[PDB]
Amino acid sequence: ADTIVAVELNSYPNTDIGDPNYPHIGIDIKSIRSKSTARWNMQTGKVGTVHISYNSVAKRLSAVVSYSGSSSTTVSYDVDLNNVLPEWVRVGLSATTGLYKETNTILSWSFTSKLKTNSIADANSLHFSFHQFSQNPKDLILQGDAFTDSDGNLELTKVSSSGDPQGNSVGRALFYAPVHIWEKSAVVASFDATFTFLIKSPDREPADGITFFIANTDTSIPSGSGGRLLGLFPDAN
Amino acid sequence: ADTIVAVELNSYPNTDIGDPNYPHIGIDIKSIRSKSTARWNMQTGKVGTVHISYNSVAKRLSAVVSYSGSSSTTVSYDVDLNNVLPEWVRVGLSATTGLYKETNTILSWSFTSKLKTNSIADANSLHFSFHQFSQNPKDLILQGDAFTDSDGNLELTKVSSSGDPQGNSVGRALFYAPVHIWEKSAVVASFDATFTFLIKSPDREPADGITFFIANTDTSIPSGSGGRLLGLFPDAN
Amino acid sequence: ADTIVAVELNSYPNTDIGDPNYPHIGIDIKSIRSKSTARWNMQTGKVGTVHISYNSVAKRLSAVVSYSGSSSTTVSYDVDLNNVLPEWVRVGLSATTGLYKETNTILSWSFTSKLKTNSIADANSLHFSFHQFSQNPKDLILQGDAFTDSDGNLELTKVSSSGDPQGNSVGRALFYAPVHIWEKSAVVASFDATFTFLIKSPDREPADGITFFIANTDTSIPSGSGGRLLGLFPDAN
Amino acid sequence: ADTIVAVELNSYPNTDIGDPNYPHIGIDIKSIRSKSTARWNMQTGKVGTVHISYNSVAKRLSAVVSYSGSSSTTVSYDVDLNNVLPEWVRVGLSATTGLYKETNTILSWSFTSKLKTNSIADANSLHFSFHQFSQNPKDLILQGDAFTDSDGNLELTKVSSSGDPQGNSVGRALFYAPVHIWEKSAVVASFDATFTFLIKSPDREPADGITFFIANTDTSIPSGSGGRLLGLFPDAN
Ligand SMILES: CO[C@H]1O[C@H](CO[C@H]2O[C@H](CO)[C@@H](O)[C@H](O)[C@@H]2O)[C@@H](O)[C@H](O[C@H]2O[C@H](CO)[C@@H](O)[C@H](O)[C@@H]2O)[C@@H]1O
Ligand SMILES: CO[C@H]1O[C@H](CO[C@H]2O[C@H](CO)[C@@H](O)[C@H](O)[C@@H]2O)[C@@H](O)[C@H](O[C@H]2O[C@H](CO)[C@@H](O)[C@H](O)[C@@H]2O)[C@@H]1O
Ligand SMILES: CO[C@H]1O[C@H](CO[C@H]2O[C@H](CO)[C@@H](O)[C@H](O)[C@@H]2O)[C@@H](O)[C@H](O[C@H]2O[C@H](CO)[C@@H](O)[C@H](O)[C@@H]2O)[C@@H]1O
Ligand SMILES: CO[C@H]1O[C@H](CO[C@H]2O[C@H](CO)[C@@H](O)[C@H](O)[C@@H]2O)[C@@H](O)[C@H](O[C@H]2O[C@H](CO)[C@@H](O)[C@H](O)[C@@H]2O)[C@@H]1O
Ligand SMILES: [Ca+2]
Ligand SMILES: [Ca+2]
Ligand SMILES: [Ca+2]
Ligand SMILES: [Ca+2]
Ligand SMILES: [Mn+2]
Ligand SMILES: [Mn+2]
Ligand SMILES: [Mn+2]
Ligand SMILES: [Mn+2]
């Protein structure tokens, strides 16, 4: 199956599969069961920013979520991605709704990767930035119900004319060019990513969440991966 | 047909189709007949560097070619690419050999595009950089005889194990992701690029040349584009 | 005296010294008498963006000014800055008020410079970005009445408690590190800059303007350079 | 006293003050006694590369040192620089010789700092990159015997015309502009850096080492900091 490494912004607690009993941010390595988490003081109707970093020398993946004038929540996890992921991967963002729903609107997204070596000349580098989404992204791979709306916003899950989110939606958006995340002869490998989002919800318990994820080049939406599984995994093992 | 815009390093004079009678660097807008050229003091055996830029306000396309120690040769052409190219395109490099041959080895390649608006936040940006090539670049589209070797050098045209260049070869390598080169609402749209190449040849007169081109996303080696047509155009019109 | 190269956003027409009879943007090379201009459809109370570029191969300096949802004004000028400026320069922004006044509020500012050579390794590079100004910029050289306010905005000219601009004000802000803008052995030299501003004015004819300027490392405010002379030149020759 | 934070490439063991009995790379927080070290298989005569990173969320400081072909040696230390360093600082490199000597030649040097907030718009960013050094760098602060030579290499410590290293020399080179390393409102604050160096020595045991350090803006070679104290500290406390 697909090899996932993800940073999830889980807004709906599904304690039956391991979630903390509150909206949280967590680092997933190959399973929906976060190897580490932190409570996310989720504020709906407000735009949020997620910054994600990793460096093969520090072996530490970390993330943070902040709102304007609101403290940030942080989470980390020591891991050596060279043991988890294959050389060539493909990044993307995902989201879902189940019984309950929220808008999984991505307002911006950037990503940078380096494959350093002997000199100040990263043998490889890749960078992309979006401060607005095109009506027809020729450089995105939209999966499921994802789509860019009239305002140049990326909508990972179904939303209607009025702007009301729909339940039971799944959607992903992968960048088009596969990234070479590590090479045997590499000295350092880095990558940073940022994305902005707006989650608004009608029901008192919003669900389910958005994630930023790295995966094998051919990652496609798993069957039965909806709702609580955030379109990343088939089961909850 | 494909809508090409290229910068060529023509090593072989085909005076009968537009070439001056000497190695030259030219700018090609939709035809092999350069809208502008310059004498290139081609040095076989030395590694050379090519820089290329474009800024939709300055509306001028430039290109230099220098070798360590020896002087550079520049060439420009004022043009508004927003009228020549589609919004979405793919960038790439091509080379060819005809009756005569040379090695069309690419050692490094960068490219940066920025699509601005009302801030120091490019609504889009795209950057890639290669200082060595993977033996299976999953981010390059290799067309024709293009292949990356054991040394991590892109080889646009066939060479032998012993290193010898082969005749009659066409080769192209496009970056995988579509670049959003311009858009209606854009305020500024720019792009830079660099590549380093090494040309070697046993012939008294090496042929045919290397080009860095910008095409439509679905571009492909046109039939009968070998030799003097450098894998970009179907005929010499 | 100081060697100035500037892009001026002249809001007040001083026809007695060469200005067009309308607010305009112009490229100044060593004199307040713009070697080139364009009418700027100045909109007060609205934030504007100025993008400025230059490339030693294209020998063309260009600028553009846009507002959200308003067309842009462009201006250019072919020039070879290697003949105008010294190797080491120091960039900055300036503004003034004379009999009339406006707020010369800079909201952001970025700058990048390259000194390319034989390889994809710019022998030199410099880049700085500000999306907010520190209460005490240790990296700016504030000249005259310039100062960063409580909101992290840079105010080049006097403004009072209420936020009302004052007449007869001059102020500049130079970045701290001198930039190496060209070197004899350089193949290409580039630089791009962006800045955001907000001009608001009580009187019907706002004056005088803001400029982005490159100058000799020790550029200081010229005597009598106030009002119409934008703090750059002593006289109007 | 100066508040130093350094990464040292200690070539000479001064076991009596904290050094392991072998060439090592260490992280120094406010003292010559490394909070962490690693065996460095120092190779005289080969050019080496040092990469260093820090991310205030990951809160971990790392450093690698590799040579072409030979393996790299890494070293980290978890620390929150926001408690160790002032908001504004200057970066730099230092080196020294005592009874024994070696050449402390810096061939290249980059540095990038980013100070984030709520978007993919770093409220501040600063980047510089040198691939060769001007014979009169007006952007470097040279302290002690530091001097750039005819070949465009920074020489932290005295060498002769013939190239021979001299004993008892202290040398420092700081980038000119103050870096805003952190700020209260900041969400994320990171930094990367790279330098390439070449160490040569006639002595059976070369001394003393090179360091990349981060100090307070007004830093300066403390008296009696020669040799084993590598120009950073006044005493071995
Ligand atoms: C029938 O209850 C079970 O399913 C409920 C609905 O499940 C769907 O909707 C949720 C939220 O949108 C989504 O995560 C699922 O994948 C489905 O799409 C669900 O609400 C319910 O959860 C609650 O109850 C369990 C058991 O008591 C708790 O462990 C959870 O934390 C919730 O409190 C349950 O899974
Ligand atoms: C038969 O002569 C014609 O073709 C010759 C060989 O053509 C092939 O090889 C060249 C170079 O490898 C390549 O450009 C072509 O596409 C073919 O693959 C060619 O040498 C010859 O050119 C010369 O003569 C003509 C006419 O006199 C001149 O116009 C040229 O500048 C050359 O001097 C010719 O086209
Ligand atoms: C007395 O008239 C002259 O000076 C006037 C005031 O000058 C000061 O204020 C202006 C605007 O703030 C500033 O540019 C100057 O440097 C001084 O600080 C000025 O208003 C006036 O200009 C107008 O009249 C002349 C002559 O008719 C025209 O050529 C201009 O275009 C103006 O219409 C004049 O210089
Ligand atoms: C007199 O011996 C002490 O000083 C020796 C020389 O010191 C100078 O030179 C070294 C290296 O160039 C430099 O580190 C110092 O700062 C001075 O500039 C030194 O060689 C010697 O060290 C050795 O012996 C001590 C004590 O036995 C050990 O602790 C060390 O590891 C060395 O093996 C000593 O400090
Ligand atoms: Ca959940
Ligand atoms: Ca030809
Ligand atoms: Ca004026
Ligand atoms: Ca020592
Ligand atoms: Mn979870
Ligand atoms: Mn030609
Ligand atoms: Mn004017
Ligand atoms: Mn030590």
XYZ file of C-alpha atoms in Angstrom, chain B residues 1-235:
235
model
C 2.333 22.198 -33.978
C 4.191 23.163 -30.838
C 4.641 26.809 -29.922
C 8.417 26.975 -29.267
C 10.571 29.820 -27.900
C 14.193 28.867 -27.586
C 17.750 30.024 -27.069
C 20.137 28.041 -29.175
C 23.799 27.380 -29.120
C 24.207 26.563 -32.797
C 27.607 25.013 -33.403
C 26.980 24.239 -37.090
C 26.238 26.880 -39.763
C 23.367 26.029 -42.055
C 23.574 29.364 -43.888
C 20.885 28.248 -46.315
C 18.256 28.333 -43.562
C 19.274 31.424 -41.677
C 22.526 30.670 -39.986
C 25.334 33.176 -40.065
C 28.493 31.466 -41.231
C 29.914 30.828 -37.767
C 29.001 29.267 -34.409
C 26.377 31.501 -32.930
C 23.926 31.842 -30.076
C 20.457 32.863 -31.127
C 16.943 33.519 -29.845
C 14.214 31.620 -31.671
C 10.573 32.606 -31.540
C 8.371 30.016 -33.252
C 10.962 29.166 -35.963
C 14.520 27.950 -36.508
C 15.279 31.307 -38.088
C 16.655 33.295 -35.173
C 15.180 36.713 -34.555
C 18.632 37.654 -33.294
C 22.089 36.073 -33.173
C 25.658 36.662 -32.103
C 29.001 35.140 -32.789
C 29.811 32.489 -30.221
C 33.502 31.741 -29.837
C 32.705 28.098 -29.175
C 35.483 26.298 -27.308
C 35.384 22.543 -27.579
C 36.599 20.792 -24.467
C 35.882 23.561 -21.993
C 32.829 23.685 -19.812
C 30.575 26.596 -20.570
C 27.790 28.390 -18.737
C 24.565 29.860 -20.140
C 22.418 32.385 -18.225
C 18.974 33.406 -19.607
C 16.442 35.897 -18.257
C 13.094 37.457 -18.984
C 10.996 40.085 -17.224
C 7.564 40.891 -18.639
C 7.927 44.562 -17.821
C 11.361 44.997 -19.342
C 9.864 42.795 -22.093
C 13.374 41.809 -23.116
C 14.776 38.263 -23.392
C 18.582 37.900 -22.811
C 21.263 35.222 -22.880
C 25.018 35.107 -22.171
C 27.526 32.343 -22.707
C 30.892 32.436 -20.959
C 33.792 30.142 -20.292
C 36.239 30.526 -17.429
C 38.785 33.119 -18.456
C 37.439 33.765 -21.946
C 34.941 36.529 -22.747
C 31.191 36.076 -22.845
C 28.906 36.647 -25.809
C 25.430 38.042 -25.168
C 22.313 38.378 -27.309
C 18.833 39.809 -26.695
C 15.487 40.327 -28.371
C 12.651 42.471 -27.180
C 9.468 40.423 -27.093
C 6.292 40.053 -25.078
C 6.032 36.357 -24.338
C 2.445 36.851 -23.159
C 1.542 36.994 -26.843
C 3.789 34.177 -27.987
C 3.348 31.518 -25.260
C 0.344 29.741 -23.659
C -0.281 30.378 -19.935
C 1.012 26.928 -18.984
C 4.195 25.532 -20.463
C 7.081 23.118 -19.800
C 10.714 24.130 -19.940
C 13.469 21.894 -21.262
C 16.746 21.422 -23.073
C 17.338 19.780 -26.447
C 20.284 18.915 -28.655
C 20.963 16.979 -31.889
C 23.590 15.567 -34.211
C 23.348 15.135 -37.953
C 26.056 14.177 -40.363
C 28.519 15.681 -37.927
C 28.420 15.187 -34.162
C 29.576 16.390 -30.755
C 28.702 15.506 -27.167
C 25.736 17.430 -25.799
C 26.425 16.887 -22.108
C 24.457 18.934 -19.557
C 26.266 19.130 -16.176
C 23.836 21.368 -14.236
C 20.519 23.137 -14.707
C 18.414 25.624 -12.726
C 15.267 27.513 -13.445
C 13.199 29.979 -11.464
C 9.895 31.512 -12.414
C 7.913 34.054 -10.411
C 4.393 35.277 -11.148
C 3.703 38.464 -9.136
C 0.835 40.621 -8.007
C 0.284 43.223 -5.222
C 3.034 42.268 -2.697
C 6.360 40.559 -1.992
C 4.399 37.341 -2.103
C 4.585 35.850 -5.593
C 1.122 34.335 -6.221
C 3.238 31.601 -7.677
C 6.908 30.699 -7.753
C 8.629 27.571 -9.008
C 12.269 26.642 -8.730
C 14.320 23.602 -9.415
C 18.060 23.063 -9.409
C 20.237 20.156 -10.388
C 23.952 19.977 -9.752
C 24.113 16.327 -10.701
C 21.542 14.042 -12.270
C 20.044 10.957 -10.700
C 20.442 7.750 -12.702
C 16.670 7.651 -12.939
C 15.395 11.212 -12.729
C 11.745 10.808 -11.989
C 11.292 14.530 -12.347
C 12.628 14.822 -15.916
C 10.738 13.752 -19.034
C 13.301 12.189 -21.302
C 12.458 12.303 -24.973
C 14.513 10.715 -27.670
C 18.066 9.625 -26.847
C 18.332 11.693 -23.725
C 19.767 9.671 -20.826
C 21.592 10.419 -17.542
C 24.871 8.605 -17.204
C 26.879 7.013 -14.398
C 28.643 10.291 -13.685
C 25.384 12.110 -13.104
C 25.501 14.131 -16.324
C 22.479 14.496 -18.604
C 23.279 13.256 -22.121
C 20.890 14.823 -24.606
C 22.283 12.800 -27.538
C 23.752 9.301 -27.915
C 27.377 8.717 -26.992
C 29.210 5.439 -26.706
C 30.620 3.785 -23.582
C 34.053 4.971 -24.688
C 32.522 8.438 -24.696
C 32.386 9.024 -28.481
C 29.428 11.090 -29.801
C 27.039 9.510 -32.284
C 25.564 11.029 -35.410
C 21.900 11.503 -36.207
C 20.660 11.759 -32.605
C 17.864 13.951 -31.221
C 17.463 14.418 -27.476
C 15.136 16.317 -25.142
C 14.616 16.602 -21.374
C 11.692 18.567 -19.936
C 11.145 19.390 -16.252
C 8.078 17.377 -15.147
C 5.836 20.079 -13.810
C 3.957 22.585 -15.936
C 5.185 26.109 -15.233
C 2.504 28.794 -15.061
C 4.478 31.247 -17.175
C 1.874 34.065 -17.163
C -1.714 34.778 -16.155
C -4.227 37.523 -16.886
C -4.300 39.173 -13.482
C -0.488 39.072 -13.103
C 1.421 42.296 -12.535
C 4.920 40.973 -13.195
C 6.026 37.623 -14.555
C 9.746 36.736 -14.731
C 12.104 33.808 -15.162
C 15.789 32.935 -15.003
C 17.664 29.822 -15.910
C 21.146 28.438 -16.095
C 22.776 25.407 -17.487
C 26.290 24.247 -17.854
C 27.298 22.120 -20.773
C 30.351 20.458 -22.187
C 30.778 19.928 -25.957
C 33.388 17.604 -27.307
C 33.893 16.498 -30.850
C 36.285 14.543 -33.103
C 34.936 16.233 -36.252
C 36.687 19.245 -37.727
C 33.226 20.791 -37.588
C 30.912 19.713 -34.731
C 27.144 19.776 -35.181
C 24.522 20.713 -34.314
C 23.884 22.449 -31.006
C 22.053 22.723 -27.733
C 18.970 24.733 -26.936
C 17.063 25.609 -23.792
C 13.418 25.870 -24.859
C 10.010 26.780 -23.507
C 7.090 25.001 -25.094
C 3.491 23.990 -24.684
C 2.992 21.325 -22.011
C 2.382 18.574 -24.481
C 5.463 19.356 -26.570
C 7.325 16.459 -28.218
C 10.150 15.874 -30.699
C 8.573 16.749 -34.059
C 9.211 14.316 -36.894
C 12.103 15.294 -39.120
C 13.491 17.767 -36.614
C 16.952 16.200 -36.495
C 20.218 17.939 -37.273
C 19.973 21.656 -38.021
C 16.371 21.828 -36.806
C 17.629 20.908 -33.259
C 14.636 18.769 -32.198
C 12.358 21.825 -31.936
C 10.820 22.385 -35.361
C 9.393 20.042 -38.062
C 10.704 22.224 -40.898
